[PDB]
Amino acid sequence: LTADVLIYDIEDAMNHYDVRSEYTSQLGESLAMAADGAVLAEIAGLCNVESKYNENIEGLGTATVIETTQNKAALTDQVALGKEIIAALTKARAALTKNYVPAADRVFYCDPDSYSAILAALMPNAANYAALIDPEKGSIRNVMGFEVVEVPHLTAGGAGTAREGTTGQKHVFPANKGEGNVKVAKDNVIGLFMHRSAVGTVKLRDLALERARRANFQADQIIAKYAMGHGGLRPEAAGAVVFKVE
Amino acid sequence: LTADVLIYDIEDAMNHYDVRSEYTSQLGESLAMAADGAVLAEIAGLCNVESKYNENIEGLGTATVIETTQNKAALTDQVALGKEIIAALTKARAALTKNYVPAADRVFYCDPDSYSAILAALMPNAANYAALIDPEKGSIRNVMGFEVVEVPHLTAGGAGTAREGTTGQKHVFPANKGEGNVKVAKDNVIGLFMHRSAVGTVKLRDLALERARRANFQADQIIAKYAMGHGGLRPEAAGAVVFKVE
Amino acid sequence: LTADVLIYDIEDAMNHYDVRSEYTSQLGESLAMAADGAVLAEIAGLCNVESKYNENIEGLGTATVIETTQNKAALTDQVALGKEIIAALTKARAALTKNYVPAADRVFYCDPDSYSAILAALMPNAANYAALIDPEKGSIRNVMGFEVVEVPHLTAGGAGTAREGTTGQKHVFPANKGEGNVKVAKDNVIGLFMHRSAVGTVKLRDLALERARRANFQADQIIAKYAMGHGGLRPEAAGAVVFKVE
Amino acid sequence: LTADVLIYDIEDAMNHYDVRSEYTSQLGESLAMAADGAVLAEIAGLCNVESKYNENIEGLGTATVIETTQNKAALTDQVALGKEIIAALTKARAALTKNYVPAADRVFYCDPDSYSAILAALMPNAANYAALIDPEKGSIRNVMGFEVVEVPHLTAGGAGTAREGTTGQKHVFPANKGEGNVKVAKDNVIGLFMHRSAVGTVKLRDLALERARRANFQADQIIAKYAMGHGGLRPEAAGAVVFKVE
Amino acid sequence: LTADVLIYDIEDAMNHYDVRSEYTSQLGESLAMAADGAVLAEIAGLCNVESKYNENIEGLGTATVIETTQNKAALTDQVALGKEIIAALTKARAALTKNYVPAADRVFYCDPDSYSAILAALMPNAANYAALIDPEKGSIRNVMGFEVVEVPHLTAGGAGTAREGTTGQKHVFPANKGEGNVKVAKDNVIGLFMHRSAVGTVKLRDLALERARRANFQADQIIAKYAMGHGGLRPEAAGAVVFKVE
Amino acid sequence: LTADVLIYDIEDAMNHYDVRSEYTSQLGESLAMAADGAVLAEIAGLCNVESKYNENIEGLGTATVIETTQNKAALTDQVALGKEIIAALTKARAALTKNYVPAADRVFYCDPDSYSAILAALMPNAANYAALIDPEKGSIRNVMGFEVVEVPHLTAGGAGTAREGTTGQKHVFPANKGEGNVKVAKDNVIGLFMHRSAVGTVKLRDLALERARRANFQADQIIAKYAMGHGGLRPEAAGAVVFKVE
Amino acid sequence: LTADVLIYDIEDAMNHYDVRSEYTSQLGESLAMAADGAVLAEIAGLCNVESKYNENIEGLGTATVIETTQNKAALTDQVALGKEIIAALTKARAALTKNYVPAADRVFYCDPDSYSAILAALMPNAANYAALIDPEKGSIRNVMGFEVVEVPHLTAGGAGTAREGTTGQKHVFPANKGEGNVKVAKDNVIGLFMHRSAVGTVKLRDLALERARRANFQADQIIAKYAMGHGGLRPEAAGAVVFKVE
Structure with a gap:
């Protein structure tokens, strides 16, 4: 269940928002360094x-x-x-x-x-x-x-x-x-x-995304939970x- | 008789109150990790x-x-x-x-x-x-x-x-x-x-309970205890x- | 792309300024000293x-x-x-x-x-x-x-x-x-x-130039970069x- | 479901109250008697x-x-x-x-x-x-x-x-x-x-517990019970x- | 003459006062307890x-x-x-x-x-x-x-x-x-x-008397002690x- | 020349005064414990x-x-x-x-x-x-x-x-x-x-006399010491x- | 060239002044431990x-x-x-x-x-x-x-x-x-x-001389050093x- 938070920190994290959950890691970026002195060339690589x-x-x-x-x-x-x-x-x-x-x-x-x-x-x-x-x-x-x-x-x-x-x-x-x-x-x-x-570097393998932390939805409203007062604190990631x- | 208080602190402790003595530990709770998505199962995890x-x-x-x-x-x-x-x-x-x-x-x-x-x-x-x-x-x-x-x-x-x-x-x-x-x-x-x-974790074996500490009942009222003044301090847990x- | 900054430190660094980039390293030298007591000999200490x-x-x-x-x-x-x-x-x-x-x-x-x-x-x-x-x-x-x-x-x-x-x-x-x-x-x-x-000495092979570090020119002004908001942070050494x- | 209340009455009943229910039954008992004129005697009795x-x-x-x-x-x-x-x-x-x-x-x-x-x-x-x-x-x-x-x-x-x-x-x-x-x-x-x-004496077989009677909870709060008005009176002992x- | 104070601590100590010295130790005793569930049998715990x-x-x-x-x-x-x-x-x-x-x-x-x-x-x-x-x-x-x-x-x-x-x-x-x-x-x-x-328990063998510690009576008043100034510090237990x- | 001061501390020290140096260590002391009952006897041992x-x-x-x-x-x-x-x-x-x-x-x-x-x-x-x-x-x-x-x-x-x-x-x-x-x-x-x-007890082997510490007599008055200013700090115990x- | 300053501190240092550099350590001083008593044993130890x-x-x-x-x-x-x-x-x-x-x-x-x-x-x-x-x-x-x-x-x-x-x-x-x-x-x-x-004691091997530190003589007055502005900081000890x- 619970472990150490270490691979999360070094790894890339993001937050796109739709109906699903979304994320960006620093993958490839060829980036045509063009050339210079005289003269330039178009950045013919691309944003990756x-x-x-x-x-x-x-x-x-x-x-x-x-x-x-x-x-x-x-x-x-x-x-x-x-x-x-x-x-x-x-x-x-x-x-x-x-x-x-x-x-x-x-x-x-x-x-x-x-x-x-x-x-x-x-x-x-x-x-x-x-x-x-x-x-x-x-x-x-x-x-x-x-x-x-x-x-x-x-x-x-x-x-x-x-x-x-x-x-x-x-x-x-x-x-x-x-x-x-x-x-x-x-x-x-x-x-x-x-x-x-x-060598978790840090893209190809890994990429963290979160609107928030694992959602802690505690429902006291269950057919058996209300009377006991017993909580239903459900981790929904x-x-x-x-x-x-x- | 007397030892070190160390397993009590790390141990779960509670207090219900009958005439008896009662205790609640974070016992092997069947936290059925129903990944669910859609659709669920009624969490096979009855509050344990x-x-x-x-x-x-x-x-x-x-x-x-x-x-x-x-x-x-x-x-x-x-x-x-x-x-x-x-x-x-x-x-x-x-x-x-x-x-x-x-x-x-x-x-x-x-x-x-x-x-x-x-x-x-x-x-x-x-x-x-x-x-x-x-x-x-x-x-x-x-x-x-x-x-x-x-x-x-x-x-x-x-x-x-x-x-x-x-x-x-x-x-x-x-x-x-x-x-x-x-x-x-x-x-x-x-x-x-x-x-x-x-690996006292912490429920399965251990679980502390108390209305209070071991009951110290000192009776000066015994047939031989009153005249001497000698006390009858009886540890009843x-x-x-x-x-x-x- | 990225390595360790260790050769740069032991290496000589300078900054002349014209249209080009410029640098000075302490090349080969005669640290002529001669024998003492009385009297000394010639110090042909012409630094190169x-x-x-x-x-x-x-x-x-x-x-x-x-x-x-x-x-x-x-x-x-x-x-x-x-x-x-x-x-x-x-x-x-x-x-x-x-x-x-x-x-x-x-x-x-x-x-x-x-x-x-x-x-x-x-x-x-x-x-x-x-x-x-x-x-x-x-x-x-x-x-x-x-x-x-x-x-x-x-x-x-x-x-x-x-x-x-x-x-x-x-x-x-x-x-x-x-x-x-x-x-x-x-x-x-x-x-x-x-x-x-x-035997990085220190000079002959090595010599650092810099008006500044690698110039970071971030252009948000590209035909595709402006609408996305995507950055064009261009390293130019x-x-x-x-x-x-x- | 429903029967006659006769064994409960002849049976020993108690009320301790913690989280689980509790009870004391007289595990049999020994009783004695004394005589008069003079010279009063003590009764040797253990109320099991x-x-x-x-x-x-x-x-x-x-x-x-x-x-x-x-x-x-x-x-x-x-x-x-x-x-x-x-x-x-x-x-x-x-x-x-x-x-x-x-x-x-x-x-x-x-x-x-x-x-x-x-x-x-x-x-x-x-x-x-x-x-x-x-x-x-x-x-x-x-x-x-x-x-x-x-x-x-x-x-x-x-x-x-x-x-x-x-x-x-x-x-x-x-x-x-x-x-x-x-x-x-x-x-x-x-x-x-x-x-x-x-020979229901009274102990070994029988012993009645009660914080109260069988707990009558009526829920008008079920997904199908609220609109119909239909009650959810559930006998939980x-x-x-x-x-x-x- | 001098040894370790370890047996004194585990051993019982008291102080009655008359012309003599006096002491009390907890001799071999009956801690009559009997069985339960029910029902206590005779506690003839006459403390000797x-x-x-x-x-x-x-x-x-x-x-x-x-x-x-x-x-x-x-x-x-x-x-x-x-x-x-x-x-x-x-x-x-x-x-x-x-x-x-x-x-x-x-x-x-x-x-x-x-x-x-x-x-x-x-x-x-x-x-x-x-x-x-x-x-x-x-x-x-x-x-x-x-x-x-x-x-x-x-x-x-x-x-x-x-x-x-x-x-x-x-x-x-x-x-x-x-x-x-x-x-x-x-x-x-x-x-x-x-x-x-x-198995120094803690009575039968051992029992400590004391009005005070070994009485140190220093007499500078002896026929040979006064002139020399030599002290006659006398241990008397x-x-x-x-x-x-x- | 110089060592550690540890034996001096445990050892008995003293100071009688005459032309010589003098010392007392806690050697023997017989000590007629005598007795009692009633019923003492003369301290027929003696202070040592x-x-x-x-x-x-x-x-x-x-x-x-x-x-x-x-x-x-x-x-x-x-x-x-x-x-x-x-x-x-x-x-x-x-x-x-x-x-x-x-x-x-x-x-x-x-x-x-x-x-x-x-x-x-x-x-x-x-x-x-x-x-x-x-x-x-x-x-x-x-x-x-x-x-x-x-x-x-x-x-x-x-x-x-x-x-x-x-x-x-x-x-x-x-x-x-x-x-x-x-x-x-x-x-x-x-x-x-x-x-x-x-087993430096404490007496038989050891006994420290001192009027003072080792005498530090510094003489600037020597035929060669006065002109040089060179000191003659002479340890005389x-x-x-x-x-x-x- | 540069090392750690640790031997200098534990080492004796001085400053005599003539045309040369000079120094005094607490060297093998023949501290003739002439126990003397009588009849003067004129310290066979010259100030060394x-x-x-x-x-x-x-x-x-x-x-x-x-x-x-x-x-x-x-x-x-x-x-x-x-x-x-x-x-x-x-x-x-x-x-x-x-x-x-x-x-x-x-x-x-x-x-x-x-x-x-x-x-x-x-x-x-x-x-x-x-x-x-x-x-x-x-x-x-x-x-x-x-x-x-x-x-x-x-x-x-x-x-x-x-x-x-x-x-x-x-x-x-x-x-x-x-x-x-x-x-x-x-x-x-x-x-x-x-x-x-x-066993740098402290003396026998070691002894520090100083009128001052290593003399830092910076000459801007050399045939090639003046026009360039290049300094001639010469560590002469x-x-x-x-x-x-x-």
């Missing part, structure tokens, strides 16, 4: 950048809290609101990188390399050095330093067996936190396990979350 | 955030203090009151994780893993690395960092032999205090020894303390 | 500092941002401005060491040794020890410690096979960063790959960027 | 009185009535309210002896002997003399005379064939009324047929109804 | 507590300090006062457990088991595992975790040869300090050597120190 | 404590500074004064434990055991566990925790090879500081190397420094 | 606190800066002045430990042990533990904790392989900064690499820098 389209009812996943706990603790609502936002904002990042889009996508394995590739066997016991070479492959045009999204299990596997550092991962850190990977900070979440690492390329 | 039962004579454990000491030191009563509260509030966390409920439960060994499992032999001399992997298993869905409850013996044994750190436990700390374990602070109490560590899943 | 000439307009490289992204995110303009500057200030260092001058130069391979030489085969799998001996050749009169500009691919090649250190390069470091090479910090960029290392000796 | 547990959605069984009949007859609401109360207060007595507890219990045959036993074949055509000997087993310790619950079928069967009296049951009486069985009054309900009779031992 | 009698002058043994030391160092008096208090308060614990009462007691060997028993040969080189089982015998009604009082020589003997841990004692610790034994902290003093460990059962 | 005698001219060892440095830095005098005080106050401790008394003593090896014994071979490479048992032997009548004086060399030997802890000494600490040995803080000085550790027993 | 002599052209190393940059940035002069001061104040520390004295000295390898010794092969890959033992050899007579000067290469080599700590040096720190070595802070400069560590013992 991508804008895409997605229509499905906001990724739902209700949360339910009783009136007694709602009254005893006033904070538990705002904390729930503050937890479920992140949950679908990470069900964003994962579903912006590779996981569950509101529209049904293929259930996938590891985090995208340059973009999602087939899962292969790794020579060391934990997933390894393919990390270093990846956002290093993104050392071309390309800006480096990308949050490799690893499962905590392979992080402990990293902390145990051969890695960039045999003890700890690339950097010795606890799971699910702003930590340290190859050339930047690591990301630890479930669903996305590390294989060949991520307002805005959205999509990959253009796996 | 539990409220549960316990009823017995409030956890007894009398402490008898003389009138002469009661008059010589005025503080000895409030300190006793301030010690026995914690005692059954830690007999709470204990009988909230795995120990002695007012109602007779099975006498159990180590602290619950994800929940209580059969005791197994550990490779190193002290109980080990299963520590890190546990609240790291609580790095999925879950928030991580759970107070692993360990005996001062295995803590000092950890401070002696192979652990996360060969000297000290996971963190070098004295026993029976807010210290340091895997990814958070450790707990050190007698009765609950460490094996495979705890008001509210109470329970597990739903061992 | 240079000033050169280049007439071509500002290495262009337009960038494009839609009005919607410009309005939603105010930062994306200043970040673009702050990215494209570096891009052509590194297209500078590059076309100041060996890359693409505003005036058409020969497309070249590796980074200059003492200056650009023919590409030869290297005995170890990655590009090697010729590193250490290069700024060691830069120890006579010469100041030592020059940022050897290596491609990321050979950096991981270094981090894999025989180098100064078999694991890591000369120093175990991330790409595209102020890292570590032979007797100083390394530079990692694409286009300039390591062969026989650089103001000042310039040239080698005297390849 | 247990208390237990039931959490579930209040025993449902909606009854829908139209606005036209609600307006035509004002009494039809209070009569319905006065009928459904008894219904779940007899679904009480039933699920207090052996029937349908809010929590799913095993579907059972006849009324408890001393407590629910296996159904056996009876020698006479109708269920017989085991009646007299049962509250005669309640002649020792226990008080005697317990409302044996029988179906109108075996009552009319008793009225036809060999019983305590060949014509009529133990006493000649109509079905579903405060009548006459062995040593006391009989009970006649459907669901609980007579086999070996009942507030308090509860249980067996400690079948 | 004790108060005893001892007559002799306060365990003496002077302490000499010259006027020149008293004048030069002002602290050496308060330090002496602060050392001799402990000395006879540990001659207390000692003559409260097993040592030298103001009234002549039998010169004894080891620390009391459940109470003083005959000294036997121990299988391992140092005194051993009888340790763990002693406060484990103290796990019925009996409280656990008692400061096992051991001689330093057997503590290093423990630190050398087979114990609970072959290196160190039960816990690897310095002598004469709040250290670590079986299921609690150890006590290290002379006179009381370890054999079969102590005010209150007292006794065993009821060896 | 030791006072001793030493006559030699204050341990000399000049410190000669120049006027130019004395005028340039005013602090260099007070710092010298503040260094040489410690020097002969550590030449005290070492000459209070075993080193150089103003009166010619035998040149000795290691620090006193219970008092200076013959140097023997130690089983581990560095000087070892005899440490733990020593001030532990001083856990009897004796108070524990004595600053074991060790050479920095054997401290590194401790930090390198088998000790109480294989890395670090008894405690991992830098040399010549208030550190950590067996049961207290360690002392590191040259001249006194560790063999079998010290005012007060003294002696062992009663080696 | 040294004052030495050195005459040569102030350490040259010109830095030429153009008028255009001098006018464009006013700070570049004061920064240069503030950089070259340190340069020859570290060429000081260097030619105060072992480097380049104004008078021609032998070109040497590593930093002095107790003073410069022959370079030997070290067992571990980087230069090692001889670190800890060295200022620990200066834990005798001497004050300890001396800035061991090491190259960034062996620092990063130390950060890679076996040292006091396998990761990092003695302390994990960046190169060319006030960091951490054995017992104190480390120094990292090029030219002085680490072998067996430094005023004061001086010498070893008395290598």
